[PDB]
A paper describes a structure:
In fact, p97/Cdc48 acts as an unfoldase that couples the extraction of proteins from membranes and complexes to ATP hydrolysis. p97/Cdc48 is classified as type II AAA ATPase, as each protomer contains two consecutive ATPase modules and assembles to a homohexamer with a two stacked rings architecture. The NTDs are essential for the recruitment of most cofactors, as well as for substrate binding, whereas the ATPase domains regulate ATP binding and hydrolysis, controlling cofactors binding and substrate processing.
We generated three mutants of the human p97: [name] (D1), F539A (D2) and the double mutant [name] F539A (D1 & D2). To structurally study the effects of the D1/D2 mutations on p97 we used single particle cryo-EM on both the single ([name], D1) and the double ([name] F539A, D1-D2) mutated proteins and obtained 3D reconstitutions at 2.7 Å and 3.4 Å, respectively. Overall, in both structures the D1 ring highly resembles the conformation of wild type p97 bound to ATPγS. (E) The D2 ring pore loop 1 (P545-N558) of p97 [name] and p97 [name] F539A double mutant also resemble the ADP state, as evident from the pore dimension and the interactions between neighboring subunits constituting the pore.
Residue numbers in the entry:
A (entry chain A): 21 to 774
B (entry chain F): 270 to 774
C (entry chain B): 539 to 672
D (entry chain B): 270 to 403
């Protein structure tokens, strides 16, 4: 709300040299003409030059040369703050050096070329780091600042010598700085960027308060996640968005030198980060410098580990230094670094979801000349198991395909037509469809943690189940004051039981959606793989994973599978207990309802389940999920068929009226068979037409009466011919009697108080 | 500092040690502290190399040579004692030990008071509710939690003024405070460090949380209280004091409560070992952890060491039919070995608890071992009244409701059942309160009433019709064939004591 | 086409080496489109009795890894899996579920034309007479 | 050549690597070929010593630093991918793979034609029967 906080707008003149004003401001201000001016924007990036040729357009705005969109700033919506400061001294000469272009063709002097006539009445009032493309020719060619006789921004006088020693420099060498990567090159990690910014911006940006407050800052931050998820760029981004100076370290480089070079290098990094402050250090591949003490064979290894422990313990100086570092798992580094005063904060970066993949694709494809029929959102949904680097690869392959696909033969004839032909090249959806099949992703076995889309209307009945689940999961995330004011303790899990294919995973996903909560799934083969392998210590990792990501629904499907692998209930003589469910017990007894983790289990044989887990302070509730009734079948059929081209004559009300005792899985089967038939007929018609035409000596024929555009009723009728049930009525009777037993256990008449 | 000693060349390290011991001899009487001694001297095995074993030997030498009447004491810090070379744990070397351990709620309250004395709190902060809501936290975790609460309070509102660089920041900080909602947000955003550590403390459970079982109380008192307070009697009559007992009976009748209560009356520590811990030693062939449990109890005596679900390994392998193997197993055999190797001078009392007394190895019910058996039955009237009150003494209840009659119509109910009743009634009350709140504030949003302040708070209590709707779902978990089984496992052993009257001449 | 035979599965069973399934599936990934054929899929179920056998139910460490691997690949990469058995009654029913094999085709004993064509295919490398009529 | 890099003293080896990468930067656009890379860099476990892990780290460094728009490609040869340190199989390092595999009968016929073109064969040699018998 400061007086001179005004918006930035377009430019009217070509070069960066003349600045504008807004005269309604200078009454309270002291804006005069001269040499320099203090102008304030983002990241302390500035371009100080002459000012005051304005009043062409309306007030409460600051007009700024075109190049100042990435000079001094990033985009529009910023604000320019205004304070002159004239009367600067005179040094002999300053800032003369181009970078990319005029290296082409003739060399000359690179100041005597075309930049000759600019200084007239404007004898070089400018600042460092200034970049504006200018020429006496096309008026668009780079120019950079290198030399500093005095470093502050100075003034020029004639009869001087300059320094253009160095042949210009290009794009890659200064690319990270030129990119000035900010929080726009980073996709798929919005939450965790929020967390990091919250951690750091106060200690790094407002440090004098952080002094006057007394609270202690972070010492060590550890970033987790698989390879290819943008962790270095994060560090650069935070450093540049905070003004802070960054020092970057690389593990295998520290370990590629002699035992004395390595430790010197560490010490010097920590030193340089103490001198320049407030700083940031980044360590990549820390599992290289410091793995599990066991694996360490040698004496230089353990010794540089000890050096790093020492150097971490000695950062207590009120010196505004933060050390960030990157690994894959936390069980991959020596555990002595994970200690109060050392790396005590952690962030999991994880695999993206479809919105994140869409962000990454938008970020990459902004210099590609796409084509009109590309729905990158269909792609982002067709990229399961991909991390960001995998999508960079996929874009690359699509584009290079589009190139070699047609213009190979012209590409061969060496000439300059290549240039215009590239200026006429595009990328199609068939390119992405070919690349996407030619890909081998990297995180198909990683654990997926996300919010699901499944909603209550993909289900149609089971209304009291819905209400129950809501009382159990929704009310304590939203209304905990009630649970205090009545002093009640909230349940932490439940067990679903009933027959197969009646929709137990859908309900868990739906109640996770309503609370916008993460969902994790553990399946039967995972439990049997821990049994067969005597590896039941992986349960603890599952529960820790859910801890980080709370609030979460942690779902255990096929919980009765180890009991079936060893007979059923007769089986051995061993009773019900086993090593994997015993660890699940141990872990549920060791977590609090303060952290909001809800556990659902699911079974189809409730009679062979260890009864210890159905005890108080454990699952302790039982809900029956039956075979669907009419409305449920109608809604299930619609949910199945809401992506195929269907007719209108067909009525699913009657299909539901004649499908009683059918599991949803069956109805799904019906739909798949009907579409199977439609496909077969369409393909046959296409074959046999185009042939019958090839035979015909009709030199001309364009009449495509597209045979099959839909799915008609006789498809469905032929399908129902193969209709099948998978759930008998002796089974229904078994579940009904496992419900009524436990409903008679609740045998009490009416109880009226006196 | 260990890692500093190990971050130098093989000759710098030993010089450094020698010079410390020297400087502490010159200035006297002194004290040396060694932090992270597992770094300089771990288990001889792990040591791979020749500078390692060599600085270990240097430290052994330097300890043996402190005999000078020179007033030097060496203190040092580890996590476990099995983490250092055992040759340092020797007469003349490190021969005294202290366990510092995890705090309890009074300690956490002390730590919170100590930290928060320069924070500008706010009036509605009961740090004692916090200290009770911080299970598994050590002191550094509470420093962290305070920090997070305060920095939250800061960024919560004054971020936008914090941004406009000027000196108003200073006065605004001079006007900043911390609320209980800050601690409530931080406390949920915490991941504590000692949730798997063994808890050793005195419990609050007292005899009135229980209502009946008076002869059980008297018995337990004769067994635990009298020798802690009246050992002169036990000498003057030359009698030997029992060292343990076994509780048996049905589930949910209160066997852990009595053990906690008799630990309270003697103001003695309590330790609990549960069924999944024993099954984890079985499955894992790791039964050498029993010795650590018993040592733990040794340090902390006088103590009640409680073994729950002692019959669990016998059930995992069938019941009594099961295999052809008899009753013995590797984990209970180590418990035997350890009970036979401790004295009644150190005051450690062992209680076990089971619900299937028929499948328990009979070796452990022999003299010089548990050797007593007490029955814990289903509760009678007064017991149910007291159990209901103990359950409901934290919720806002009505006065019209009478729990006398609830107890009069609940016969054959385990305390666990009655607990279920109470939880369901509060469940219903909560549901109605939330619905009313929703639907009012909506019906008002619809109404074009630009002004309305009348909050007739709908549900402030727990009334009888809640309880009645709950009792509709009342359920028992203990049949009468089971009651008959326990009754016949009591009368058998009461007939074994079959003797008429025996009058001396 | 790739073929995996019965002694290979029994060699992973006897040897507790069932982590070689993943290499098979990766091999098929590189070479797609491919038919990956599993012959004698019921062999571990016969080595341990038939259906009476032990008290253990139908599950085993090698077919469980085959399940894990089929649930982790996409139809975008065009890998089709065929199995073959002669005792369909002792096969773990988890693998005949949706998103898995889930179709069953009967292959019977050959009829007339089938035998004629089979005889000719057998004899199309030997010097035969003309008088003989197949 | 791997075994040659490992047949020298710890300082000759790393100099040699650096000089190869240098010479391939000077002359460009170039190609480097590394044969028997399982010799320079096997599974981190098998590595016993300190010159071993150190030349592995040197090669990782030298791969990460090829970003110069310098038109250098590094090709290398192994038997299996589980035979090299997995840190080389990473974005920016060796990220593309090709399986060369065993030939089929058309390929064997090609190889035989390629070899036998300076042999003075005889009229009754059907190398295609051979290619099917190999």
């Amino acid at each position: 709300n400061r007086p001179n906080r005004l918006i930035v707008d377009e430019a009217i003149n070509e070069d960066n040299s003349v600045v504008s004003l807004s005269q309604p401001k200078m009454d309270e201000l002291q804006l005069f003409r001269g040499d320099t001016v203090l102008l304030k924007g983002k990241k302390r990036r500035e371009a100080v030059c002459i000012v005051l040729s304005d009043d062409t357009c309306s007030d409460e705005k600051i007009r700024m040369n075109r190049v100042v969109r990435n000079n001094l700033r990033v985009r529009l919506g910023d604000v320019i703050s205004i304070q002159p400061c004239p009367d600067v001294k005179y040094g002999k000469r300053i800032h003369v050096l181009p970078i990319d272009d005029t290296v082409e063709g003739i060399t000359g002097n690179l100041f005597e070329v075309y930049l000759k006539p600019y200084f007239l009445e404007a004898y070089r009032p400018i600042r460092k780091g200034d970049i504006f493309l200018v020429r006496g020719g096309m008026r668009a060619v780079e120019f950079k600042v290198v030399e500093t006789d005095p470093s502050p921004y100075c003034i020029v006088a004639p009869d001087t010598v300059i320094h253009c020693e160095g042949e210009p420099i290009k794009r890659e060498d200064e690319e990270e700085s030129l990119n000035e990567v900010g929080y726009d090159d980073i996709g798929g990690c919005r939450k965790q960027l929020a967390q990091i910014k919250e951690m750091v911006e106060l200690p790094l940006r407002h440090p004098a308060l952080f002094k006057a407050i007394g609270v202690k800052p972070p010492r060590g931050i550890l970033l987790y996640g698989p390879p290819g998820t943008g962790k270095t760029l994060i560090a650069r981004a935070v450093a540049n968005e905070t003004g802070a100076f960054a020092f970057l370290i690389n593990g295998p480089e520290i370990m590629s030198k002699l035992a004395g070079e390595s430790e010197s290098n560490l010490r010097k990094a920590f030193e340089e980060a103490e001198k320049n402050a407030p700083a940031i250090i980044f360590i990549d591949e820390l599992d290289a410098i410091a793995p599990k003490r066991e694996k360490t064979h040698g004496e230089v290894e353990r010794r540089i580990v000890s050096q790093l422990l020492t150097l971490m313990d000695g950062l207590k100086q009120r010196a505004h230094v933060i050390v960030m570092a990157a690994t894959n798992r936390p069980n991959s580094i020596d555990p002595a670094l994970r200690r109060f005063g050392r790396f005590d904060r952690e962030v999991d970066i994880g695999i993206p979801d479809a919105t994140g993949r869409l962000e990454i694709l938008q970020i990459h494809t902004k210099n590609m000349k796409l084509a009109d029929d590309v729905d990158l959102e269909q792609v982002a949904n067709e990229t399961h198991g991909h991390v960001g680097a995998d999508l960079a690869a996929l874009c690359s392959e699509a584009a290079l395909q589009a190139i070699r696909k047609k213009m190979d033969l012209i590409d061969l004839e060496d000439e300059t037509i290549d240039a215009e032909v590239m200026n006429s090249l595009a990328v199609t959806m068939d390119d992405f469809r070919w690349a996407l099949s030619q890909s081998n992703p990297s995180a198909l076995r990683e654990t997926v943690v996300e919010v699901p889309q499944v909603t209550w209307e993909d289900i149609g009945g089971l209304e009291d189940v819905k209400r129950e689940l809501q009382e159990l999961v929704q009310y304590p995330v939203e209304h905990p004051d009630k649970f205090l004011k009545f002093g009640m303790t909230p349940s932490k899990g439940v067990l679903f039981y009933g027959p197969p294919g009646c929709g137990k995973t859908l309900l868990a996903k739906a109640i996770a959606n309503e609370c916008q909560a993460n969902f994790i799934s553990i399946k039967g083969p995972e439990l049997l793989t821990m049994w067969f392998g005597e590896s039941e210590a992986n349960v603890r990792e599952i529960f820790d994973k859910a801890r980080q990501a709370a609030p979460c629904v942690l779902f255990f499907d096929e919980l009765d599978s180890i009991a079936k692998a060893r007979g059923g209930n007769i089986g051995d003589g061993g009773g019900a207990a086993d090593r994997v469910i015993n660890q699940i017990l141990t872990e549920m007894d060791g977590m609090s309802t303060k952290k909001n983790v809800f556990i659902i289990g699911a079974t189809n044989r409730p009679d062979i389940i260890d009864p210890a887990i159905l005890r108080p302070g454990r699952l302790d509730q039982l809900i029956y999920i039956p075979l669907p009734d009419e409305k449920s079948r109608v809604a299930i059929l619609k949910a199945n068929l809401r992506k195929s081209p269907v007719a209108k004559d067909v009525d699913l009300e009657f299909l539901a009226k004649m499908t009683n005792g059918f599991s949803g899985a069956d109805l799904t089967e019906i739909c798949q068979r009907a579409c199977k038939l439609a496909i077969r007929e369409s393909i046959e018609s296409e074959i046999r037409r185009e042939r019958e035409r090839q035979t015909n000596p009709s030199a001309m024929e364009v009449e495509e009466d597209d045979p099959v555009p839909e799915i008609r009723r006789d498809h469905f009728e032929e399908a129902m011919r193969f209709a099948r049930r998978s759930v008998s009525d002796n089974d229904i009777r078994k579940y009904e009697m496992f419900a009524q037993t436990l409903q008679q256990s609740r045998g009490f008449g009416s109880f009226r108080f006196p």
